[PDB]
Ligand binder design. Structure first.
Ligand code: NI
Length: 444
């Protein structure tokens, strides 16, 4: 008859809870393309203060972690603090450790102390190597140092067992261990020196490595002696089939968090840009682009603009210059939208001229060329506009005509383009891009 306990310690800050869904999508794209799976994921935070940690802890952390929250921290901290099981896929050095330590500290702190007959622990962190266990435990101590109500003992192989037994004699709220040693300690002396009965929180870090180094049997047996309503988080740089299979076995309604696994834009889309200095130059490029394309002759294009007034203007402009377009926007009667869409889907080598906001929902097949005439200002809009050309192997090209003053636009391009896409273009255009993006970035 299990003892009930609290796992959700998260109070969403007002400023975060005010965020809309579109805002949250955008924040995830900007944070190195965070991808989530699972139901009910809390919104990412962007500041240590949105987590409701005491001043002590705040001072301590800062001290402990210098600079901005990492993408993994932004998303994993509120999900774990909320008591959810979590799969966190991110590289070593992404700061993942505090992502689980803070919530673990909080959870263990809240539980009643160990009785005079209870060994502990309440929290268990498993690592595949002695070197990682020691590193994790060093972190832990930087927090248990201030607070004498909480101990951690590090239990690994390649190290005296008797030494660690002397520790565990005194009871311990937290254990950091390699799987073999832990199992060895559990079974030792009728399992009377270490109990699993009070473990409510298990973390497995570098989880892919645990299978690599043959620990499936040990970690599987450990999870079998742990209450199944425990909170469990699995952190790993990769997600091999073995881990995927293990998570299904040990987790409930997990939230998976993957940081920039793949590119925000399909890698088969060829992203390009041209930096211009007047609307006129932008228009000169747009025309050169439309003619040039013909020498490579389905093959259709879509010019994206930012407003209905711009769409009308550019439509007339392009007309006066011998180029006929199928123009579309929400200020036009639906009947003529349909006429233009059908004309576009009908006529060979047609050109659609469309507002960026209608891009996600356009009912047309993928195209060979997207010309973004007004650099978009969000990551979400960039994905929807460029995605109009995405088509696995048959993906075409998306090109942005950017103006010298469009700093945020350059920030987006610098974050969504592949490095090798920026290399193949003129090194001065490239250099301006990076300068534009840096200026925007320090602008905040
Ligand atoms: Ni310039």
């Amino acid at each position: 008859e299990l003892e009930p306990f609290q796992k959700n310690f998260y109070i969403e800050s007002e400023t975060v809870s005010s965020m809309s869904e579109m805002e949250v999508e955008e924040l995830r794209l900007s944070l190195d393309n965070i991808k989530i799976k699972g139901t009910g994921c809390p919104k990412p935070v962007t500041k240590w203060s949105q987590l409701g940690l005491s001043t002590d802890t705040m001072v301590l952390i800062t001290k402990l972690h210098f600079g901005s929250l990492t993408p993994i921290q932004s998303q994993a901290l509120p999900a774990i603090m909320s008591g959810r099981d979590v799969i966190g896929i991110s590289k070593t050095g992404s700061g993942k450790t505090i992502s689980y330590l803070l919530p673990l500290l909080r959870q263990v702190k809240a539980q009643r102390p160990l009785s005079k007959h209870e060994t502990g622990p309440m929290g268990l962190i498993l690592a595949p190597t002695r070197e990682l266990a020691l590193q994790i435990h060093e972190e832990v101590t930087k927090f248990t140092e201030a607070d004498t109500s909480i101990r951690s003992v590090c239990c690994t192989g390649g190290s005296e067992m008797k030494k660690q037994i002397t520790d565990l004699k005194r009871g311990t709220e937290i254990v950091v261990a390699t799987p073999g040693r832990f199992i060895d300690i559990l079974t030792l002396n009728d399992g009377k020196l270490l109990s699993t009965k009070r473990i409510t929180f298990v973390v497995m870090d570098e989880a892919d490595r645990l299978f690599d180094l043959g620990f499936e049997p040990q970690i599987t047996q450990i999870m079998k002696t742990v209450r199944p309503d425990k909170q469990c988080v699995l952190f790993s740089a990769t997600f091999p089939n073995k881990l995927r299979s293990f998570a299904v076995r040990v987790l409930h309604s997990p939230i998976s968090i993957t940081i920039n696994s793949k590119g925000m834009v399909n890698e088969n889309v060829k992203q390009k840009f041209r930096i211009c200095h007047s609307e006129d130059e932008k228009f000169d490029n747009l025309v050169q682009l439309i003619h040039e394309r013909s020498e490579f002759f389905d093959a259709k294009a879509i010019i994206f603009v930012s407003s209905q007034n711009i769409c009308d203007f550019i439509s007339k402009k392009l007309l006066n210059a011998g180029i006929v377009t199928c123009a579309i926007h929400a200020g036009k009667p639906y009947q003529e939208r349909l006429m233009n869409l059908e004309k576009f889907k009908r006529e060979k080598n047609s050109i659609l001229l469309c507002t960026e906001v209608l891009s996600r929902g356009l009912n047309v097949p993928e195209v060979s060329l997207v010309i973004i005439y007004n650099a978009v200002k969000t990551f979400a809009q960039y994905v929807h506009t460029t995605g109009r050309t995405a088509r696995g192997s048959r993906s075409g090209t998306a090109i942005t005509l950017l103006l010298h003053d469009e700093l945020s636009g350059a920030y987006i391009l610098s974050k969504a383009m592949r490095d090798e896409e920026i290399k193949a273009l003129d090194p001065l255009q490239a250099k301006e891009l990076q300068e534009m993006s840096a200026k925007f970035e320090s602008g905040m």
